[PDB]
Design a protein around this ligand. Sequence first.
Ligand code: HEM
Length: 213
Amino acid sequence: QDLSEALKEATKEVHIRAENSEFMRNFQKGQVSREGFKLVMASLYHIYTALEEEIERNKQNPVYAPLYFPEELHRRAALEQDMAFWYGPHWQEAIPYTPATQHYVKRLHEVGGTHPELLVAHAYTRYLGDLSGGQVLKKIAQKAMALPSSGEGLAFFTFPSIDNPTKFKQLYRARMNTLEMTPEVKHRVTEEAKTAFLLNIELFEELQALLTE
Ligand code: HEM
């Protein structure tokens, strides 16, 4: 079975759980506040910073390299734009770095530094989601918060080097399926993708509690 399929199958249950965290339930209903949106975007800033650091570290490593698409996919620059928008010109000292965010970053560094053959799990979990369900969440955030179509404040959700997310996502899948796979690697990849999803659930659980306080 192709890696792209094995990952979708392995994570379909946990994906249902992630969508039904209280934070994402409220988000999907159009209930997201500026405060709650700033917290989740700042946390994604740290997460994608760490993810992309480890991507760069491993760009030439054949357990990752066929998925090296910085121009198309990488989000750090976009997230920097969004931080300036939501937090102002001194955003680097204003933004929070929550403990659940720290925990996700920690595991990203463990994977990139000691288990790079699992980095595909983390890239899959973030980028493929960003290219599908992320586009729906974009439209909901725009409507909730009166964000302009010109795209300010939502750079994270915009892929100006990808014409068509559906076709790109098919290419990314196809390339995933060229990675050298053994039963060992494949089983651990799908396990790590479940962990990536849990790390996101745990963030959303944390941010909700911070917001409810
Ligand atoms: C309310 C929150 C969310 C909604 C409404 C949502 C919605 C979607 C939708 C409509 C798809 C396309 C499904 C398909 O093509 O069959 C999708 C795919 C995906 N989503 Fe989400 N999602 C949400 C949260 C998440 C979270 C929190 C993650 C991980 C952090 C995530 C990761 C993914 C991944 C990796 C895929 C690709 C599945 C694949 O094609 O292999 N999503 N999502």
